[PDB]
Design a protein around this ligand. Sequence first.
Ligand SMILES: COc1ccc(Cl)cc1C(=O)NCCc1ccc(S(=O)(=O)NC(=O)NC2CCCCC2)cc1
Ligand SMILES: Nc1ncnc2c1ncn2[C@@H]1O[C@H](COP(=O)(O)OP(=O)(O)OP(=O)(O)O)[C@@H](O)[C@H]1O
Ligand SMILES: Nc1ncnc2c1ncn2[C@@H]1O[C@H](COP(=O)(O)OP(=O)(O)OP(=O)(O)O)[C@@H](O)[C@H]1O
Lengths: 282, 327, 327, 612
Amino acid sequence: LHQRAKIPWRACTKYLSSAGILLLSLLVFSQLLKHMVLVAIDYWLAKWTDSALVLDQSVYAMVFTLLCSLGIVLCLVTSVTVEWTGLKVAKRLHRSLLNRIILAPMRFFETTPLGSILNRFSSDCNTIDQHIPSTLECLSRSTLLCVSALTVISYVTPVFLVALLPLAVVCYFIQKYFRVASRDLQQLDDTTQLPLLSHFAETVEGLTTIRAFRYEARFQQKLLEYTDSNNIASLFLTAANRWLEVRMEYIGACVVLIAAATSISNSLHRELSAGLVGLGLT
Amino acid sequence: RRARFVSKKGNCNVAHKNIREEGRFLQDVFTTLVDLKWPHTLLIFTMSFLCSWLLFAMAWWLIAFAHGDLAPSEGTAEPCVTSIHSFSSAFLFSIEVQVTIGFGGRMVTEECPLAILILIVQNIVGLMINAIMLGCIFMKTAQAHRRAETLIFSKHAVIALRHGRLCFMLRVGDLRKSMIISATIHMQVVRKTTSPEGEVVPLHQVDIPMENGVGGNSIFLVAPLIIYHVIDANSPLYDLAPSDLHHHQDLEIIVILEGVVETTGITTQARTSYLADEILWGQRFVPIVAEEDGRYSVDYSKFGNTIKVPTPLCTARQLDEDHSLLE
Amino acid sequence: RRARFVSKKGNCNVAHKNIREEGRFLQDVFTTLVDLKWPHTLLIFTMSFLCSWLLFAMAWWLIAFAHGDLAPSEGTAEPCVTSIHSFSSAFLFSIEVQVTIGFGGRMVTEECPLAILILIVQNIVGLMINAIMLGCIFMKTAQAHRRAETLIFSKHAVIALRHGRLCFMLRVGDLRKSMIISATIHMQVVRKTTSPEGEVVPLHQVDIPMENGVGGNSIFLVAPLIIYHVIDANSPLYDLAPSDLHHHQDLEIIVILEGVVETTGITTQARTSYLADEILWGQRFVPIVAEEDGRYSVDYSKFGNTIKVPTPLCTARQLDEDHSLLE
Amino acid sequence: PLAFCGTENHSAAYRVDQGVLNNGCFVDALNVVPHVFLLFITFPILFIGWGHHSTWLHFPGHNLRWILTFILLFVLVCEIAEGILSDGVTESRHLHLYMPAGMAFMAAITSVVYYHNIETSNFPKLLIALLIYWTLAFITKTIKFVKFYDHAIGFSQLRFCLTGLLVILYGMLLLVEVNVIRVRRYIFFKTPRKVKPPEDLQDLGVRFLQPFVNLLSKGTYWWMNAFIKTAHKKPIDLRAIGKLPIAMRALTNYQRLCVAFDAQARKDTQSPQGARAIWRALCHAFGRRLILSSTFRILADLLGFAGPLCIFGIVDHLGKENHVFQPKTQFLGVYFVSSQEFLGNAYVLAVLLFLALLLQRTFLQASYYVAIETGINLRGAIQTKIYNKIMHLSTSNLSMGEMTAGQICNLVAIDTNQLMWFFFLCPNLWAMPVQIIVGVILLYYILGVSALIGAAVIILLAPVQYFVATKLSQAQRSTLEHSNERLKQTNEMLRGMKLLKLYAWESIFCSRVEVTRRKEMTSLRAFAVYTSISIFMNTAIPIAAVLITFVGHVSFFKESDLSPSVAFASLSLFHILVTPLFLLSSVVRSTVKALVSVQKLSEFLSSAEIRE
Ligand SMILES: COc1ccc(Cl)cc1C(=O)NCCc1ccc(S(=O)(=O)NC(=O)NC2CCCCC2)cc1
Ligand SMILES: Nc1ncnc2c1ncn2[C@@H]1O[C@H](COP(=O)(O)OP(=O)(O)OP(=O)(O)O)[C@@H](O)[C@H]1O
Ligand SMILES: Nc1ncnc2c1ncn2[C@@H]1O[C@H](COP(=O)(O)OP(=O)(O)OP(=O)(O)O)[C@@H](O)[C@H]1O
């Protein structure tokens, strides 16, 4: 149970260390700088609109254009960097796995099943080659966007941190419980998908024998049981997903209510500009 | 048609006629007062309090008139009770003295001793009727008849072969966590029986023994357990054929559960009946208890489900004769 | 794993599922109200009193507004209730009338009859709910479930040879000077038993007879005395080998002590259980009573101490067969 | 101190001589009555019940009364907001403007909880309290509405509209309670109609209790709390996961699909198992639930624009210099806020934004769940249909080679899955056009033609995402072919590894496996390039759109000057519009794959069969 609920920190560390110091450093720097540039773009929009409210407008337009162009360039840089990192890690990892499997003693091949060795090269290599780069990019971008957004709405309203702490605790508990439940449900969903397809194959290649024994009804009932197991696994997985999403959207509703109320109070009679509350609201 | 001695919910359907009441029904007045349903009891007690208030209001108003306190006066004389100007003042004052609120705008003074005597009498009878109502609804609050409604019996009783012998089986369960302490079960066969001398009794009740390890009538009811009576050589159901289990057969088997509630410490009684059509042959109750996740779980959805079991379709006397033939 | 029917402290571990409640759990509302733990019961009753006070405070405030007593009057009008200036005055007045303190700064006058009617209604319902709470916690004050916790059973039961025959022995004691009047003990063997016809019951309870001189179930419990069941030819523990006394053996022996308290006169029930591992073989309880300085003294420090005694390590059926071989 | 009517003109609002019923704060106090009564009766019952397993049932009008009470809570929040908003000018606090509405809000929540505990315990005779409460609330609200009409209060003042909504809602809830009386005769009838809970709910082993919980528990998925908290304690297996409810079972959905197929086959007999017939059968089988999901999705799409609109209103109000709010209309010495100046306040727009998002995201998740559940039911029914076709097909066509085991295997594996995933994304088919069109219209009204230019550039994301997705799919197809060859070589090497160890023939095989790996890497480089292009376009087209719309608005068009309200509302509109535009290409590709999958499934179902 302790190993089940444990995030594979060592595996992620080895995966990122196979990329090299230069490429990983460039990836981290590009991601952080790009999200800072996006924050700068929206903050400059707030200052621009405040200046137009009080009303160097061409200077404002030129700085906004420069910031947006820098953001587009850095988006290209971070996309190319994360895909390059995935390619390099995939190549090095497959080469190392092939060489180490080759150097293994014959006792290892005699005792261990062929499926365990080959499933790495088939499924785990495919996952590392294709799915992990995009998932790593999505996780990095979403985490940095959430952190930058919380930082912005805490910058416009410093009193938001007081309400941010209990919301952070509640969100942490929600995501922990969802992660353990969702891991179990996803694994169960795949393991329920497998025997249904195997049953379809077995029935097709042995149809004459099945119909000669008059075992059509029994095999149909077996199929009904298999697909009911797959359906209930899928339904529990999507119910857990909707549970998490409802909780997160309600947390976001509380966040926008607190940020709105505090920013309106600070903007009415505490000398906060309208652009900053609009920034925090978005 | 086919009148039953006791209903399925335990209500007794006997009509009682030509009862020479000699006041014995209302001499036990407090039992009636507890036995009234709750809106009736509330109506009785609010009516008694209102009647006492109105009677002593009339007394106070009469005293205030007879002392001249109702006539306006300059101020030489002092009233028996201050500020009694009409019957409304007397009614408010009677309420004040009897419920002991005592606002003090209208108070008894020392002028006429009749007001003092009426004050004494009103306080005595107010404490008296307050005590009477209090004790009556303390008995009523302690009634365990609603605790008897959450003791369920199976709708169908079954006769199945158990240990090579016929057994009349029923299931009784309890829905609450509260125990029923010293739970005893009495079972009867209510049937019109004719004596060999020609004596005909219409509702003859024969106590049938519940099968028990100690040979008595005592159950420990936490989970719903099957109550069964073993049909042996000396039993009223000895000649009970499968064909006798139809609606217009003179046969009713009442079951009387009894015991005290763990909470109130008051003996309660739950009961039910089984007519001949309600008794099933060749069936036995499904297993209702399961061990789930380190606890014994009872699935009450399968409380009265029976599975049709191959049992010999002949009465237990024929089973004894046929078994002696085989042996 | 190894779910037990009743715990060592008497708690029943049965989970009840799929209970079609038809309001029967809350129709017995007074049993629930007594059964709530003491902080919950206090919370219910203070909330009910506060709700009644607030509701009639709203009534008094509404009447005082509708009569114009809340406005600064011209000085001629007489209020329904004197000195009601806000909702706080109405709340204090509602408290005064319902608890019958009656300070009299705010009192009902004879001006509007609606105030008189509300006074009548508030007094009636105040006496009513005061009576309801009073009776509920009089039942709660009389609960003997805490008196069942001071009746102790030995943690280990023992099977030892007594008078040339196997006996399942346990010790029960009472810690208080107060007697438990008409103390009866019921013992069961709770075990999943399979009938010869194929009927499988999961929690089959078989009443085993407590060995007594009069052949019944009645004990006189002053000093802790050893309760023992004689394993004879017709007993559920007849084929109970020493090897069967392990944790994952389907065997539980529950013991149910019952009786009324000498103080409150209310029947209480104490219980415990003994799994197969909790039953010791070849041991018997140490003597616990001694005669010290002209009195019989009980040393409760040796309440559950057992001495390993040489007994035959075979079941009682084998004892009967082997004894018939020797005889 | 606090006064109910307020301390004005030496408390002249407490004067009642003119008529007690036409005094405004006395009928406002009469309004408080039913709420206090409801709290008084219902609190001890709930508190006693809060001090086993029930297999609850649902009373008639359950969904209707949950919807009605949600609307009631929204209207009572509006009542509290306008009451607080309308006494911001007077020195004394008028409690009667918002405190009756606050106690009404508390009483409505209490009524929902009390109804839930009545419904679970199945004791409908406790609904007498709800009947009395709805009667009293409806009567007092009707008195307030009638006295408002008698005192020349029209629809210009918001409080009149809100109290009319309250009259209508209390009447509807009273009608729901009377309908509960009529259907289940717990009062006035000699024998009540006994109703048993559903048979799949009584099954100890059905643990997907979504169709049986209440409407709030269906929208918030509150029944998953116990399941997930237990899943933290112990791992989930095929036993902790229960049995399917009867509504969602392969036999049930398959029989429903068979009924739909028979109804379709009666109409057109030229091709009873063609693609059109299968599509019409799927519509007849699952269309009500599909349009329920689409209704939730459309309502969520419309309510999601309350974000930018409330942002526009809030920042427009906060951008107003020296704002001096003072409601012009005053009746009976009591101020009334009109509807135009009600929605001009930043606080109530924030509160309405909170409520609108709270409702909108719940509706979006409900649409997602209904679409997923119907896709899963369709997958079960379609798999049962395919397997029933398998039991009858002749093995001669298996011999001829027009079918294999692999063809039927992938017909279940990817084709049924594609149809299921299309039914997942089916409400998007008209949700995304509606949301995109309404968003572009709101962009035009908020900002102008510059927003039209920016919206055109952000709409350009969908065709380029479609092109990049097509190139990505074919690049991964080439990668799949090379990976299959590499797995073939690796499998042969691993199986002949003993002989390779014997002859020291490893590195020569490593060279060939690595040559295949290098060619696979050459394909995977193009795959990763197109993935990077997709990511860059998705995360850079909104930046370009925002840049061009604001720069063109201030420089090229030279329109009305940029304000924080319009700019941040437009930015929120772009943040809303980016996601459906990105997923539109995936939805279109899913629709095309669904058409191909249904055609393939029709060609399978229209094949040869053994004779009877
Ligand atoms: C996240 O969606 C969207 C986001 C934006 C837009 Cl504009 C449209 C959609 C959309 O069209 N969404 C409806 C369809 C949908 C699909 C997956 C998910 S899900 O939660 O990510 N995943 C699962 O539930 N998978 C279950 C697990 C068992 C097998 C497959 C079903 C949630 C919903
Ligand atoms: N119809 C009746 N209703 C109520 N009680 C009755 C009735 N008949 C007799 N009893 C009671 O039965 C008892 C007398 O027994 P029995 O049936 O022989 O009556 P009895 O001799 O006619 O009566 P009594 O002794 O009053 O003259 C008394 O307790 C009497 O109250
Ligand atoms: N799941 C349950 N929970 C609580 N009580 C139950 C349950 N099932 C049956 N009962 C009770 O058992 C008795 C009826 O016995 P039985 O088990 O045969 O049920 P039934 O015939 O289905 O019920 P009903 O008579 O209400 O239609 C009634 O007192 C009923 O309240």
